[PDB]
Design a protein around this nucleic acid. Structure first.
Lengths: 135, 54, 116, 92, 78, 58
RNA sequence: UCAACGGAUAAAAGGUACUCCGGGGAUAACAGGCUGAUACCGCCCAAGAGUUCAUAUCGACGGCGGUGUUUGGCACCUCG
RNA sequence: UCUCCUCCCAAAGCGUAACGGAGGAGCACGAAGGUGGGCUAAUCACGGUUCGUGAGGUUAGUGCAAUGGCAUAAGCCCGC
RNA sequence: CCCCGAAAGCUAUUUAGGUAGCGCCUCGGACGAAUACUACUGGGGGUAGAGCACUGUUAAGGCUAGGCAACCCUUUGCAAACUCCGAAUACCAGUAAGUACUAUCCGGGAGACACACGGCGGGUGCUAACGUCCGUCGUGGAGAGGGAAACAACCCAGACCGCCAGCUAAGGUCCCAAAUUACUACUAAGUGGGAAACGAUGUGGGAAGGCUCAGACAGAGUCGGCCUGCGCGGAAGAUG
RNA sequence: UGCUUGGCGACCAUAGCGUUUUGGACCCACCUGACUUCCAUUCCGAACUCAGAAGUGAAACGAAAUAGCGCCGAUGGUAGUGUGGGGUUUCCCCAUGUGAGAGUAGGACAUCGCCAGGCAA
């Protein structure tokens, strides 16, 4: 599970997740898994998908995780009333907008990449697409 | 809480006008009686003023 | 860099003089030669100007780099500015210490009737 | 490769978007001494040839009847759909 | 079950009080600021708290000037 | 320069406060009320403000 | 350190199930309501387990719903 | 928890709430104030039982939070 | 009976369901465009966005001090309390037209200081709540009428009175129930008229591609992707 | 009339750095000397200062050249957004208005005033 080694601030206001992604191009590998939907990608979700991919490729080729969960999410404990200050950080998320290439793979055949990515895609909470490096 | 230790003092005109300025001092840094030229408004002149209590 | 250091030492006064809107008497001084300009408040246009590179001062003096030269230039620039109707100036040392030739020039420009 | 291109009369967001709804895409041709020209291209036409290498080496754009040799300079792609939103062609 | 936070100062109503082109009397505060976010130009004084105020009547002019590209408030004669 | 006619076609109930002010400024008072106004960049600007509830006749 | 910081007095702690009055559904306890984090049920992927064999049975890591159904949140109704 | 200061929330004037997110103050200083004159950092590189040269350009400094400032320094030294 | 018509805010409070000043209402007086709206002109922005120049945070590779790896370099992201940048709006001011009893000032009288929902920007909460706290606009409050089955707060729209007149708004036009016909498609699921991941030879359109009368696919077509419209499953609740 | 240098400015990178080359007529710089002391070193004539002028443009400085690095920068598109509508409403779309940031083409080795000197008209 990924999280910032340190942070300037422990808690962050919720905010909003409008817009399209910035890093929308396969920039390190040949194939990538791109987000079509919008959402929060938890660190747990990120690692589930990574394990899925890695197992499938069977120690062949390289994998680039291009999303880092750096937004702390807090939850109020159960049986606590509203108030008495912001809740405790429970998990970290990465804000995903449509277009964001989240993972990349190289040094494997495209069909193995498509399968690896389909398996990872199934661990993820929003829709994705297979993408290739372009000119 | 209050951490202030600088003692308040009244600087008094060396003329007998009885005009005084007030200020404060660190009694450790300034053990002796403070002396300083200051305008006395009664005699309308700059004269020496010397420390006194209150 | 000596020139930059000097210009640094000059800026505070020059900026002040500009703020005051005063006519400025700028003095430059080099190991040989010495210079004096009266400049308008705008700081662009020179009203009067004397130096030891000028022929008339160069001839009338022995060395140009002397304190005696600085007295000549002080006198010259003052007379020329008084002709232009420049009375009351602000003296810009231009980063040199008020001393020796610079002060000598200043004194001579005061003696000639520039007020500062 | 030769593509028909129409010079854009209406420019900006509302127009650009309408083209893209109509299966076309705004594009611009610049380079040399001639002013940049804003053109409409057919999406399917261009995009179908963008798999070919020759496309990137050079194409001809028939703009206002006149053949213009241009190389692709920049492509703005859609965020996640396999579409092209805009292209810059540099006169060759 | 409590907050270590809670605190905040009173807002100090800083900012430009008279914008470009405004007619000001001598004394009129133009800018209230912390430090020289704006510098004093012609016909503008600067207080101890870096308050810029009109030294003369006229119109407020903002201007970037100088080698550092600093903003200056001046009063223009009008 | 020439006078244009302007009708109010929709209600001013619920409109932004400045938009109601603009209708007042055109002289419009009720639905279907038409005013004749000198065509002017100023008068045009007011119309642009409330175009959604104003029909112009030129 | 009138710091409860516009500073009731110079000068002040508790108990009441022995209790009382005026009020409040402005405000809690019951039940209803809203919500569904949680829970419960279902489903998706299939790492694997299962002699062999993902899918007889089970289903890791993750994901999506449904119910109102636990633990909760809220304070809308009811304190003549 | 209660007053005060700084930032964020605060929606590019001002102002703007929550038992919202973060820190500070309840002083210090007769110079650490006035003014004249002067000066310019951090950190490296390299050579030397702090020193020199170079790079660098304020990443330093600011009596004490943060913010805005600061080379004409508001930073550093000295005389009066 | 007639005219006008709020507030549920700020500040303070042994104050919080009270009260005071202020804001908002009214009445009188003064004053008269100084006001509002718009165009133009002049301003300051540091928000949205964006970016990584700073501060942090992040990935890969290089290079290498060091002991694997700083620091740099290349590439790649993230930020309420980051900014090399940077809008729209809003605000301040000026100039000017037209429209408007506006603005302001001084007095008499108040009431109110429990707000609600909805939109938009946010904090909090689970980007839960008919939740909670702000900003701003609307409506309700204090607002009838028409629509939304019924429905303060949504949509349309502001009721002086009368009329067995006419036109329209939102919304509608088979029958309940006032009003519609023609034409072109699509859907077969009562979808319409609740529900996702995902699943699937459902079906319509579009633009390409591969393979094929030298024989494809199982003697003429066939296979698979893409962009799209509409449907199917996924889909269990308590009186009918 | 140039062509240069010096001073003071405008302007504040399209102007800047870096690199290369070049200059001593004047100027500028470095330079020479400073118990004798105007003045100076929290030590030092480094600086500041004074008295000078043999040397040298080495350094610096100026100038020229150089897109090397910074800087500037369209058109087009994109983002956002005011108003009014719509939706599949955690987020979008449509009409209209506005319109970045980044990037691309490209630009760019400034421009200008006052005074004075040298050279040369």
């Amino acid at each position: 599970m990924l999280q910032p080694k340190r942070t300037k601030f422990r808690k962050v206001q919720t905010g909003r997740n409008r817009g399209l992604a910035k890093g929308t191009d396969v920039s390190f590998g040949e194939f990538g898994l791109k987000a079509v939907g919008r959402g929060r990608l938890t660190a747990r979700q990120i690692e589930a998908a990574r394990r899925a991919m890695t197992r499938h490729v069977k120690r062949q080729g390289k994998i680039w995780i291009r999303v880092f969960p750096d937004k702390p999410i807090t939850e109020k404990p159960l049986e606590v009333r509203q108030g008495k200050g912001k809740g405790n950080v429970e998990y970290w998320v990465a804000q995903i907008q449509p277009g964001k290439v989240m993972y990349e793979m190289g040094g494997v055949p495209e069909e193995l990449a498509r399968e690896a990515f389909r398996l990872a895609a199934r661990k993820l909470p929003f829709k994705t697409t297979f993408v290739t490096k372009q000119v | 809480a209050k951490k202030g230790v600088r003692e308040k003092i009244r600087l008094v005109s060396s003329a007998g006008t009885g005009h005084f300025y007030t200020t404060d001092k660190n009694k450790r840094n300034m053990p002796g009686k403070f002396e300083i030229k200051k305008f006395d408004p009664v005699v309308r002149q700059h004269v020496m003023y010397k420390e006194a209590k209150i | 860099d000596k020139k930059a250091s000097r210009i640094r030492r000059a800026t505070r006064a020059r900026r002040k003089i500009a703020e005051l809107g005063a006519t400025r008497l700028v003095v430059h001084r080099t190991p040989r030669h010495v210079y004096a300009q009266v400049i308008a408040a705008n700081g662009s246009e020179v009203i009067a100007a004397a130096s030891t590179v000028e022929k008339a001062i160069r001839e009338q003096v022995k060395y140009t780099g002397n304190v005696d030269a600085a007295k000549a230039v002080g006198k010259a620039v003052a007379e020329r500015a008084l002709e232009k109707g420049v009375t009351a100036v602000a003296f810009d040392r231009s980063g040199f210490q008020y001393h020796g030739r610079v002060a000598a020039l200043a004194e001579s420009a005061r003696e000639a009737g520039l007020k500062f | 490769m030769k593509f028909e291109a129409v010079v854009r009369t209406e420019l900006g967001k509302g127009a650009s978007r309408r083209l893209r709804h109509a299966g076309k895409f705004p594009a611009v041709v610049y380079g040399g001494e001639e002013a940049a020209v804003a053109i409409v291209l057919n999406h399917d036409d261009i995009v179908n040839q963008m798999d070919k290498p020759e496309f990137y080496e050079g194409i001809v754009l028939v703009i206002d009847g006149k053949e213009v040799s241009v190389k692709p300079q920049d492509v703005q792609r859609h965020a996640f759909k396999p579409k092209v939103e805009h292209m810059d062609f540099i006169r060759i | 079950g409590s907050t270590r936070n809670g605190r905040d100062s009173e807002s100090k109503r800083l900012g430009v009080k008279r914008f470009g082109g405004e007619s000001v009397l001598a004394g009129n505060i133009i800018v209230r600021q912390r430090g020289t976010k704006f510098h004093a130009g012609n016909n503008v004084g600067i207080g101890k708290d870096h308050t810029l105020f009109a030294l003369t009547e006229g119109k407020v002019k903002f201007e970037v000037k100088g080698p550092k590209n600093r903003k200056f408030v001046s009063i223009e004669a009008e | 320069m020439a006078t244009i006619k302007v009708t109010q076609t929709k209600s001013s109930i619920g409109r932004l406060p400045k938009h109601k002010a603009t209708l007042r400024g055109l002289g419009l008072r009720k639905i279907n009320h038409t005013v004749e106004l000198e065509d002017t960049p100023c008068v045009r600007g007011m119309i642009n403000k409330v175009y959604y509830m104003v029909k112009v006749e030129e």
